Structure 1
């Protein structure tokens, strides 16, 4: 899995993976990015909670919630409400794209 769509959840100890990269939301709440197992970046929120999960909101904001729903860390960046996609890319970057520009259907093109 290399994509997390808005509204979806990555639960404790699960990861996104692309090429040599992995993005894991750890049970103890640290969101960590690895390159061949080497920690290259982290939200630096280890042990700030337990049973943590990662979710992408309808406005594109990326947030880590602990089991009691406290907002542990977030990209703290939002756009208009709609549908977004977090992509862990083979180049190591995890980018949030959105909202929807196009898909099939009548008024399927934004603006």
Structure 2
């Protein structure tokens, strides 16, 4: 999967991927990093500032990283209209937050 939809989280050790070389991972050392063939090309730069961290996209558009103590250690501070948003690792290698909802099939949640 290469997307994370609000209000869900990307937990420790998990990542979004766009084959065959792009990997955006919420690391165990709390750093949120984008790797391109093993080389980091973007990151929140929060490694070592915690452990058991998780990345969460909120229904208002704000993207945050919580540590094990459930405290905010990093955020985009993009607080907008209450609705639903999505975080996407694109094939063009850009990582983007889009929202609010423009249209939906209604085939989910299911």
Q: Structure 1-normalised TM-score?
A: 0.89
TM-fit CA distance, 1:104: 4.7
Structure 1: tracts of 5 or more residues without a match: 106-111
Structure 2 spans left out of the alignment, 5+ residues: none
- Partner of residue 43, structure 1: 44
Alignment match, 1:103? 104
Correspondence for 1:108: none
Instruction: Give the C-alpha shift of residue 78 in structure 1.
Output: 2.2
Report the counterpart of residue 87 of structure 1 in structure 2.
Answer: 88
Cα distance between partner residues in 1 of 2:100 and 2:23 = 24
| Aligned pairs (5 A) from 1:17-32 | 17-19=17-19, 20-32=21-33
Measured in 2, the distance between the counterparts of 1:76 and 1:51 equals: 22
1:33 is displaced (CA, Å) by 0.6
User: Could you say which residue in structure 1 is the equivalent of 2:8?
Assistant: 8
Q: CA RMSD in A?
A: 1.2
1:41 Cα deviation (Å)?
A: 1.2
Which residue of 2 is the match for residue 33 of structure 1? 34
> Counterpart in 2 of 1:109?
none
Structure 1 stretches of at least 4 aligned residues deviating more than 3 Å after TM superposition: none
Q: Which residue of 2 aligns with 1:75?
A: 76
